[PDB]
């Protein structure tokens, strides 16, 4: 639904690195170099950001409002 705050395995704070990640995708950056620039060294946080699907806005499209 939404990006988890913490990485599941290690526990590094990953919730605050989501929208900026999207900015790097809004820029010309690839996935790997954007993850490197965000500072995700070990592959668990890279899996956290890379494999996350942002369903929150799609659900909000069905929100009452």
């Amino acid at each position: 639904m939404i990006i988890p705050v913490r990485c599941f395995t290690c526990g590094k704070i990953v919730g605050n690195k989501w929208e900026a990640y999207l900015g790097l995708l809004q820029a010309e950056y690839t996935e790997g170099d954007a993850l490197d620039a965000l500072g995700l060294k070990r592959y668990c946080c890279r899996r956290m950001l890379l494999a996350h699907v942002d369903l929150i806005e799609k659900l909000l499209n069905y929100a009452p409002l």
């Binding site: 639904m1 939404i2 988890p4 899996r47 494999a51 699907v53 369903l55 799609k58």
Partner: peptide, 22 residues
Amino acid sequence: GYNQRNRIDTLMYLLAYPQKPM
């Protein structure tokens, strides 16, 4: 689905943080 919140079924299972497969 995208309307899983408005839908009212007799039994529904959701995952808190689903992720697409690697």
